[PDB]
Amino acid sequence: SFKCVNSLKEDHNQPLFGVQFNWHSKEGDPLVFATVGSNRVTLYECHSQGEIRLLQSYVDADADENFYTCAWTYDSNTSHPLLAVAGSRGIIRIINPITMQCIKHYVGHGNAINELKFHPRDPNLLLSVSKDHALRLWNIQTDTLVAIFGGVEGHRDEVLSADYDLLGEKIMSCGMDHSLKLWRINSKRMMNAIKESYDYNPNKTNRPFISQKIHFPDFSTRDIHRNYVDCVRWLGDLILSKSCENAIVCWKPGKMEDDIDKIKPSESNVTILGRFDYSQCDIWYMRFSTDFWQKMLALGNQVGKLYVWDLEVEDPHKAKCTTLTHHKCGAAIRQTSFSRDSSILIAVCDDASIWRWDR
């Protein structure tokens, strides 16, 4: 069971909107996590007796930048960890976490970036979701924009979240238009676009790299939630998603026995497999997280309470809930992060505080 072993507060006193453990940290090295809030990203190291050691920050040159998301990857040639951050300026920054130098940046989105995700099998493929209603897929090895997921049949309002499935064959995205949309990236067109992005070297050719314009999702529903959908994650072939209605819904496209890879774009049905209710989390912009193995699910609420669900059960509706409270933790928990082994759970808050829970 989890016990709160420590807490701290960042000096900017602004909300912390993101937190991620580095699940690519090397064997024998202490566990490391990043936080994003105000116009900065900060790294910490977890030590014994609940110690959280402060390392170093990246502070944006723009005092008006607001980072909203961060994601870890590694350099595909050296294995060294890399950290990607983005927010209100709509600029993706690739940071060397050792020195906190910005090694490169990507511009493209017409507005703020709400979430970054790396492909589960390819460390170079980065997905960004934006307030400009689109998703973008980048190849950070050749610095190319592989594809833009948008158009009339794409999202009709700001995109808040997206997630890759287990093999990175498809993406589920969600946002302010109340919809959840599926985008297959294992199509002949998308597998070819990814192969071409790797073959692109602007020093060895005259052509610009041509980005795919994907204007039609492979599935779409507005039947799960009745407000902004601000967080989505795959749970095998099933989906976990939430709005600001005090619930995480577990669902799938089509009928109960329909295989996800047989689903057609015209599919009009969904199946609800369960719903995890909770309290006082009815404000926009609150994220839930799962651990590496997807044995657990965590979400914080707007008054500092943590909910943890044990997903190691036969069916999703049988998940077992644990609640974690501390008399000094009373600010909204925007995001949580589990260490790769789930031995540590970190919660980050609206008052710039960080809470460490050890198993």
Ligand X SMILES: O=C1NCc2cc(C(F)(F)F)ccc2-c2cnc(NCc3c(F)ccc4occc34)n3cnc1c23
Which positions touch ligand X (CB under 6 A)? Answer: 15, 17, 66, 68-69, 112, 114-115, 160-161, 230-231, 285-287, 334-335
Query: What is the per-residue DSSP string for 258-323?
Result: --TTT--TT---EEEEEEEE-SS--SS---EEE-TTSSEEEEE-TTS-EEEEE--SSSGGGPEEEE
User: Of 20 and 69, which has the nearer Cβ to ligand X?
Assistant: 69
User: Of 126 and 194, which has the nearer Cβ to ligand X?
Assistant: 126
Size (the chain), residues: 359
User: Of 129 and 308, which has the nearer Cβ to ligand X?
Assistant: 129
* Cβ count near 58 (within 10 Å): 22
Q: Rounded to the nearest whole angstrom, what is the least distance from the CB of residue 335 to ligand X in the complex?
A: 5
Q: What values do phi and psi take at 347, rounded to 5?
A: -120, 135
Q: Rounded to the nearest whole angstrom, what is the least distance from the CB of residue 86 to ligand X in the complex?
A: 10
User: Of 200 and 307, which has the nearer Cβ to ligand X?
Assistant: 307
Q: Where are the beta strands (DSSP E) in 67-121?
A: 67-74, 81-87, 91-96, 101-107, 113-118
Q: Rounded to the nearest whole angstrom, what is the least distance from the CB of residue 122 to ligand X in the complex?
A: 24
Contact in structure between 336 and 289 (CB atoms under 8 Å): yes
User: Of 17 and 357, which has the nearer Cβ to ligand X?
Assistant: 17
Give me Rg for the CA atoms of the chain. 20
Q: Rounded to the nearest whole angstrom, what is the least distance from the CB of residue 287 to ligand X in the complex?
A: 4
Q: Rounded to the nearest whole angstrom, what is the least distance from the CB of residue 112 to ligand X in the complex?
A: 6
